Design an enzyme around this catalytic site. Structure first.
Site, PDB file in Angstrom:
ATOM      1  N   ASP A 133      19.138  -6.457 -17.515  1.00  0.00           N
ATOM      2  CA  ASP A 133      19.055  -8.053 -17.061  1.00  0.00           C
ATOM      3  C   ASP A 133      20.300  -8.497 -16.254  1.00  0.00           C
ATOM      4  O   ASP A 133      19.866  -9.376 -15.382  1.00  0.00           O
ATOM      5  CB  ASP A 133      18.416  -8.333 -18.880  1.00  0.00           C
ATOM      6  CG  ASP A 133      16.872  -8.252 -19.193  1.00  0.00           C
ATOM      7  OD1 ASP A 133      15.973  -8.412 -18.863  1.00  0.00           O
ATOM      8  OD2 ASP A 133      17.058  -8.919 -20.743  1.00  0.00           O
ATOM      9  N   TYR A 139      11.695 -13.215 -22.206  1.00  0.00           N
ATOM     10  CA  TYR A 139      13.091 -13.336 -22.313  1.00  0.00           C
ATOM     11  C   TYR A 139      14.014 -14.152 -22.389  1.00  0.00           C
ATOM     12  O   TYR A 139      13.839 -14.968 -21.438  1.00  0.00           O
ATOM     13  CB  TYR A 139      14.089 -12.117 -22.781  1.00  0.00           C
ATOM     14  CG  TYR A 139      13.667 -10.685 -22.545  1.00  0.00           C
ATOM     15  CD1 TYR A 139      13.092 -10.138 -23.197  1.00  0.00           C
ATOM     16  CD2 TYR A 139      14.130  -9.935 -20.782  1.00  0.00           C
ATOM     17  CE1 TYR A 139      12.566  -8.362 -22.697  1.00  0.00           C
ATOM     18  CE2 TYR A 139      13.337  -8.782 -21.574  1.00  0.00           C
ATOM     19  CZ  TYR A 139      13.081  -8.063 -21.951  1.00  0.00           C
ATOM     20  OH  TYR A 139      12.450  -6.429 -22.047  1.00  0.00           O
TER      21      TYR A 139
END
Ligand SMILES: [Cu+2]
Ligand SMILES: [Cu+2]
Ligand code: NA
Ligand code: NA
Ligand code: NA
Ligand code: NA
Lengths: 620, 620
Positions: free
Chosen positions: B290, B374
């Protein structure tokens, strides 16, 4: 009318009168423990019967007694004479705290040891320390305390700064005799003071802290009924208080739609021990069962608004007995309040365009106790999402010694000539489980690593395995942080909407357990502390992991003897005992008063609910 | 005038103009990364030179470039053409998020797979997923994204409730071609919706929550000067922001009397990866860096007062570049506030009669980012007693799949037919240490158990051992929770008043590290994640544990190549890299939106101060 209500002053007065009328509470008797008994399994008769358990000490040397009284019916149910050489001595009495120093002040061996060190006896404080069981055959069956000395330069001086090393004494507190005085050599008494309110040591106080104001303009979100029944954000429970264990939580349940679902029947810290790791003969006997030997509930502090508890506080003021059976109120001894706890759930979605944020909060139930140099805060937390957490906050003043010339492998130096022996603080949580009812089982869950190969061609797969603990003999378990080990308590007869058994997962901190040699006295007396998790079948009389009478008990009592019954625990009424502790290598920053350090555990829902239980929380 | 000030809009505009004038930012160019470089070691010249590092992508297929610009002097310092098959592709562009779905909607293989499932292409969302490096030789040197499909029944519907399993596609986003479409079979698309704002799913909203009001009537206790310099309760630091790493902390120091004492030169989360443990070929390639692939700073949320951040909040609004070099402000992207934090220190003394209580508080610096499903909150905390702590809060929506008939060892069931693959979230904290200066060393501290015998006759002794890590090749370390393992960073040339080196102790949570097989692609690309602690010698260009260009890089870059230099780290300028993560076996309670779970680490003083540093805190 609740059977789980706090003891009242009138109930304690009635126990006093019942014992007096029965001939069990004459002038030579002292109450060493008094507490209410929980209702037996199957109290669905609702026939109120409040029973109290009393340990009665005799200052004239007669045998002590264990007595059970019915305050409802005004009767003695049972009274048994105790053979303390067999089953253990009674807990330390508050009135014995000053006896050790008083007896030593007239002993010529003690006085000669002090004179060699040019110490004025009027300035020497002696700590009243539990004795344990070691090599001294004359102590079997006698009520012994040991004493270590600290100098107070003036009445408001912190004596912990001035340990008198090389010197220890043993005292029989019933016959009022000093049995042994041991002087292994002169150590300089550390001279620096440790007075944390002295401006010479603090410097000027900070002027930079601006106030933080926490208020609830509409009052708190919880309700208290019947004295100690709490309802808060779908949780329901009763707050109990016992002079040995402190705050006890009963009947923890969660309102899931129309159904009140039980989770935990009784939660307590059932024991806590502080073993010391200094092999010097002056201190190598030191192991303080603060709960079992001293009773942490009786030394609970009165908590001051805005100082100990901040915000919109609801207090309980529990009542305990003094040594003569008179009620004594601990004013503001329990704090209850809710706290904001940050973000609960948050998502900003790239496809729906919806932005969603909800805040968390927790209910706090707390008390603080002081046992000599130690001060411990016990905090229970309930969260909106079903999580239950316990936290211990350890502070106070570290127990000190001299720091030897040429250093030490078992003592930290805090100041010139001043040491602090290595030690642990180890707790035992007793969780009488009731996950959706009493038919529960425990599973151990480990992460499973998988090898790259057929069916796992890219070597990415990982899984988990669960092992049911079926009998008590296989239910003594160790942590394994590397494999992510947790324990699940489930109800095999209550399934969620996916046809899976409902459960709660216990998350440990995986701190070291008891470090002492397994052949040591403390390993046998604190056997619970050698393993992280024990599971027993419920029994009314299996209350403490160390047994009923911990003081000077030779060992093996409590959990090791319980699990020898090898009872069925697969879908039964079971009790989880979780060991967790702090290992304390004191640092300079711990001196002269220690900032809080913490340890605890938590339980989280694991398929207990059919989906997130906080979808109905509003957007603030 | 501070060299650590946040980038301003004018600085980014100047970078744009410099690149334009130099011929490096024509119409076919896109800025994939732009950030300010830290001052080099020995910036004691105070000659201001603000340098920016830029990754430039070319949409016409020409080679991308890495460029360093001096905004102070208006010059290009260096420009290098990148061979992406060797050194890695550039990070994912925000404008590529929609390209995968658009390209697949006209591909006849994709359309035939959707027609077999009776899915309307206009309702099918495709996630833009990083590709990694696997067996497909045609992907070497090409900019690839992979796509997994989710159905949106209507524009505000949560697509995560409706995964289309059995289907995956690969896309070349530069040449605009679908390289492969893989259909392994028809799975039912789970039909239940996951709309957590739908009253049919939430039920009536709670009316029981009363407000909690947190105010500071005199304002906060911290000051902000020069845009991002914070002073609070003896702490001093600068709050930076980078589009890849997010919030970065610079120059963390503590005012100890007259001396400003450095503790940490730079603290950041330098990488974070989410590996998935489902061996299905539809998902067995999934590993999302990420930070390194998507850049978590660019998706930072604007944080709403009273909702995301509660109390007396000071905001920073960092400025980043868009893909064309125009400044873009993230309004209210960083929250700063102080919070009450319970009891700091407490003691009631049986001999002096003094009762003492002080309260703790912490400074909070936080941001929240959203990467597809997320949402992560990054929290840095500074405490009165010298403790530094980091906490990640993981929430959002779980990544879903079908739940197969006859169950799965690698997927949790959340709802009828709906699964959630097992995965981890693993972070790397990069701590450029400066304990009282730059001459630092790391020691590993284990508890030592001692055997009962001579010198330990009662079997109670325990001790500790410290091992200095002297060279990089011996500085790759594993956790050991059972032996209480911690790591101490000390300065061997700076001693406290007891003549002991000053230090700070790193306390890990001891959660499992990377679970994948060591021969897997992800174990080689995320090698940092296989060990808990790494120590390197500082170097200007060793910034990330995965290297500079993570996307589609074949592996080995970053920490394994750095430590091969085997440099001296015993009393040198060193960097600690700490791996810590969550292992997520999704539970029913995580659905349809997940309550926060947390992981982190903390550092505590270890003989850094000469005594407790909070003796001058006033009594509230
Ligand atoms: Cu301690
Ligand atoms: Cu997750
Ligand atoms: Na015995
Ligand atoms: Na039970
Ligand atoms: Na390569
Ligand atoms: Na450094």
């Amino acid at each position: 009318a609740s059977p789980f209500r706090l003891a009242s002053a009138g109930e304690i007065s009635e126990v006093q009168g019942i014992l007096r009328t029965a001939g069990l509470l004459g002038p030579e008797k002292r109450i060493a423990y008094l507490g209410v008994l929980d209702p037996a399994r199957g109290a669905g008769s609702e026939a109120e019967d409040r029973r109290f358990r009393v340990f009665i000490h005799d200052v004239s040397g007669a045998r002590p007694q264990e007595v059970t009284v019915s305050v409802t019916n005004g009767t003695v149910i049972s009274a048994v004479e105790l053979d303390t050489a067999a089953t253990g001595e009674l807990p330390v009495l508050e009135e014995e705290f000053e006896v050790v120093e008083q007896l030593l002040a007239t002993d010529e061996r003690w006085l000669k040891a002090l004179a060699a060190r040019n110490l004025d006896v009027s300035k020497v404080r002696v700590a009243p320390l539990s004795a344990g069981v070691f090599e001294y055959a004359e102590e079997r069956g006698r009520r012994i305390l040991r004493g270590l000395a600290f100098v107070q330069d003036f009445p408001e001086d912190s004596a912990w700064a001035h340990p008198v090393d090389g010197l220890v004494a043993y005292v029989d507190v019933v016959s009022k005799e000093v049995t042994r005085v041991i002087d292994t050599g002169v150590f300089p008494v550390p001279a620096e003071h440790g007075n944390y309110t002295d401006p010479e040591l603090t410097g000027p106080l900070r002027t930079t802290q601006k106030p933080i104001s926490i208020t609830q303009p509409e009052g708190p979100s919880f309700t208290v009924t019947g004295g100690n029944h709490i309802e808060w954000e779908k949780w329901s429970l009763d707050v109990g208080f016992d002079v040995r264990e402190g705050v006890v939580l009963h009947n923890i349940a969660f309102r899931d739609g129309d159904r009140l679902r039980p989770i935990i029947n009784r939660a307590s810290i059932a024991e806590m021990v502080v073993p010391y790791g200094d092999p010097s003969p002056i201190r190598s006997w030191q192991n303080y069962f603060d709960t079992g030997e001293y009773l942490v509930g009786q030394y609970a502090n009165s908590l001051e608004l805005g100082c100990d508890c901040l915000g919109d506080i609801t207090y309980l003021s529990p009542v305990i007995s003094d040594a003569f059976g008179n009620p004594r109120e601990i004013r503001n001894g329990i704090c209850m309040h809710e706290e904001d706890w940050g973000i609960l759930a948050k998502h900003s979605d790239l496809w729906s365009g919806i932005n969603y944020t909800r805040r968390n909060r927790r209910m706090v139930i707390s008390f603080f106790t002081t046992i000599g140099n130690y001060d411990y805060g016990f905090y229970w937390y309930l969260y909106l999402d079903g999580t239950i957490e316990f936290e211990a906050k350890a502070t106070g003043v570290v127990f000190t010694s001299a720091f030897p010339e040429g250093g030490s492998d078992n003592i930290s130096q805090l100041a010139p000539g001043l040491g602090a022996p290595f030690h642990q603080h180890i707790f035992s949580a007793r969780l009488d489980m009731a996950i959706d009812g009493f038919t529960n089982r425990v599973e151990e869950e480990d992460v499973v690593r998988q090898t790259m190969g057929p069916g796992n061609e890219r070597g990415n797969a990982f899984s988990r395995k669960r092992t049911v603990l079926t009998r008590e003999s296989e239910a003594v378990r160790e942590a394994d942080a590397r494999t992510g080990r947790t324990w699940i308590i489930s109800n095999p007869e209550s399934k969620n909407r996916l046809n899976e058994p409902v459960g709660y997962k216990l998350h440990a901190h995986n701190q070291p357990t008891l470090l002492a040699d397994p052949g040591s006295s403390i390993a046998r007396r604190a056997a619970f502390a050698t393993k992280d998790l024990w599971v027993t079948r419920y029994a009314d009389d299996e209350r403490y992991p160390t047994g009923d009478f911990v003081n000077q008990h030779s060992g093996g009592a409590g959990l090791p003897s319980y699990i020898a019954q090898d009872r069925d625990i697969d879908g039964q009424d079971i009790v989880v005992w979780h060991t967790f502790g702090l290992t304390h290598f004191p640092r300079v920053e711990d001196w002269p008063i220690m900032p809080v350090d913490t340890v605890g555990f938590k339980l989280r829902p694991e398929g207990f609910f059919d989906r997130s239980p906080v979808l109905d929380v509003p957007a603030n």
